[PDB]
């Protein structure tokens, strides 16, 4: 019955602004405390801030690394939670969740102001902070090296996601592993695709990686050879 849906995520330049929305249903929204939580890619959950209810004057608290730049508000006439992000930084990149916040205080063993727990969560909306525009990748060969050997292609400095990598036009799929892209501090992505091959086939078989970057309409075919 409880439904929380985040929206408003997208690409924003550093120093810009963005507003995330969270529409709620299935519970008494007016008297409910609401929390924003973010998760940077590959990292853990981070508490962003929370807005209280009518008895607290709708007061809002923020994380220290967030104060001065984010504003949390609510519109009880539309059952929506808001997160306004100003002067946005690259570290603000990640998935943003809204959470219905509960309140707990044990009379005999608690300590004010008790603790807050998150009963219900949304599915999250992705925010990407990057100064970069559309850019095709630079493909570099990774010559075979001892692992059986391993060889591959380094797909460097592209934007935005995604990039697909195949080998020998899809004819080589055994032993192939394409890693997830890492977002660099420059705002560009990079990844690697690697295949494990027997060392006895390094001078007999040819290996061509096929890199396709649809956002920039770029295709690259690179042959990986021993030194």
């Amino acid at each position: 019955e409880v439904r929380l849906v985040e929206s408003g995520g997208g690409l924003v330049k550093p120093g810009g602004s963005l507003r995330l929305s969270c529409s709620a249903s299935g519970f008494d929204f007016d008297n409910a405390w609401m929390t924003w939580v973010r998760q940077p890619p590959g990292k853990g959950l981070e508490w962003v801030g929370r807005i209280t209810g009518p008895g607290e004057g709708w007061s809002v608290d923020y994380a220290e690394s967030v104060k001065g730049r984010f504003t949390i508000s609510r519109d009880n006439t539309k059952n929506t939670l808001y997160l306004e992000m100003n002067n946005v930084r690259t570290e603000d990149t990640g998935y943003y969740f809204c959470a219905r916040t509960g309140k707990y205080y044990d009379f005999w063993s608690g300590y004010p102001p008790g603790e807050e727990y998150f009963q219900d969560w949304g599915q999250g909306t992705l925010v990407i902070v990057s100064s970069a525009s559309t850019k095709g990748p630079s493909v570099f060969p990774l010559a075979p090296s001892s692992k059986t050997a391993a060889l591959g292609c380094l797909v460097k400095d592209y934007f935005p996601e995604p990039v697909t990598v195949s080998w020998n036009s899809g004819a080589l799929t055994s032993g192939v592993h394409t890693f997830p892209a890492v977002l660099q501090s420059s705002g560009l992505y990079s990844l690697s695709s690697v295949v494990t091959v027997p060392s006895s086939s390094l001078g007999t078989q040819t290996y061509i990686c096929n890199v396709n970057h649809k956002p920039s309409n770029t295709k690259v075919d690179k042959k990986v050879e021993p030194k």
């Binding site: 008297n31 209280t52 209810g53 009518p54 008895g55 607290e56 004057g57 309140k103 205080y105 009379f107 005999w108 608690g110 300590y111 004010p112 102001p113 008790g114």
Partner: peptide, 18 residues
């Protein structure tokens, strides 16, 4: 329970026990 200020309730309930 929501009519009162939560940060003040728990503070008041802590004074009663102590």
């Amino acid at each position: 329970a929501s009519l009162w200020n939560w940060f003040d309730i728990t503070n008041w309930l802590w004074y009663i026990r102590r």
